[PDB]
Design a protein around this motif. Structure first.
Motif, PDB file in Angstrom:
ATOM      1  N   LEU A   3     -55.396   1.385  55.074  1.00 39.60           N
ATOM      2  CA  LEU A   3     -56.218   2.664  55.731  1.00 39.60           C
ATOM      3  C   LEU A   3     -55.143   3.640  55.840  1.00 39.60           C
ATOM      4  CD1 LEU A   3     -58.156   0.599  58.470  1.00 39.60           C
ATOM      5  CD2 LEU A   3     -59.149   2.236  56.891  1.00 39.60           C
ATOM      6  N   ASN A   4     -53.883   3.445  56.006  1.00 38.40           N
ATOM      7  CA  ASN A   4     -52.925   4.438  56.473  1.00 38.40           C
ATOM      8  C   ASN A   4     -52.571   5.163  55.161  1.00 38.40           C
ATOM      9  OD1 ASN A   4     -51.610   4.860  59.122  1.00 38.40           O
ATOM     10  ND2 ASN A   4     -51.439   2.802  59.073  1.00 38.40           N
ATOM     11  N   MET A   5     -52.355   4.276  53.877  1.00 39.60           N
ATOM     12  CA  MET A   5     -52.159   4.740  52.668  1.00 39.60           C
ATOM     13  C   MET A   5     -53.383   5.620  52.170  1.00 39.60           C
ATOM     14  SD  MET A   5     -50.137   5.258  50.270  1.00 39.60           S
ATOM     15  CE  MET A   5     -48.925   4.377  51.014  1.00 39.60           C
ATOM     16  N   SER A  10     -55.848  10.968  51.209  1.00 36.98           N
ATOM     17  CA  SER A  10     -56.789  11.892  51.292  1.00 36.98           C
ATOM     18  C   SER A  10     -56.206  13.378  51.668  1.00 36.98           C
ATOM     19  CB  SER A  10     -57.664  11.408  52.626  1.00 36.98           C
ATOM     20  OG  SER A  10     -58.366  10.249  52.445  1.00 36.98           O
ATOM     21  N   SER A  11     -55.079  13.132  52.182  1.00 34.36           N
ATOM     22  CA  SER A  11     -54.225  14.396  52.559  1.00 34.36           C
ATOM     23  C   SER A  11     -53.702  15.044  51.134  1.00 34.36           C
ATOM     24  CB  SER A  11     -53.105  14.324  53.477  1.00 34.36           C
ATOM     25  OG  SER A  11     -53.668  13.991  54.749  1.00 34.36           O
ATOM     26  N   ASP A  12     -53.321  14.269  50.466  1.00 33.52           N
ATOM     27  CA  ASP A  12     -52.854  14.852  48.951  1.00 33.52           C
ATOM     28  C   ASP A  12     -53.946  15.332  48.213  1.00 33.52           C
ATOM     29  OD1 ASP A  12     -50.400  13.555  49.498  1.00 33.52           O
ATOM     30  OD2 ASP A  12     -50.869  11.550  48.524  1.00 33.52           O
TER      31      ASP A  12
END
Lengths: 55, 55
Positions: A3-5, A10-12
């Protein structure tokens, strides 16, 4: 961890999309300028002989 | 009086074929064939046509 990755990914993707939108903003701008140029060229005050429209 | 009249006839012809706006002869018959088109609108087709006769 997944989930963190995925948040990172998603930010990328958001960064990529922002790049593309920023690219297309200048497309909008120069298209507006081109339309203005065409509307000015369209009038018969301008002469093809003395190179008014070729500029 | 005919001397005077002939000089005035040369002047009435001179004004006709030595009048110009932006290197464009107006009173000769150049525009009497098709006419001058003015774009008086943002969009396409928003024009007005005009014609000037030989004088």
């Amino acid at each position: 961890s997944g989930l963190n990755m995925a948040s990172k990914n998603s930010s990328d993707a958001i960064s990529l999309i922002q790049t593309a939108e920023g690219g297309l903003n200048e497309t909008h701008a120069i298209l507006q300028r081109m339309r203005e140029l065409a509307v000015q060229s369209r009038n018969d005050t301008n002469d093809e002989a003395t190179n008014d429209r070729s500029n | 009086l005919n001397d005077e009249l002939k000089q005035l006839q040369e002047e009435i012809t001179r004004i006709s074929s030595q009048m110009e706006f932006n290197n464009k002869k107006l009173l000769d018959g150049s525009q009497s064939t098709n006419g001058l088109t003015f774009q008086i609108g943002a969009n396409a087709g928003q024009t007005i046509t005009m014609k000037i006769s030989t004088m």
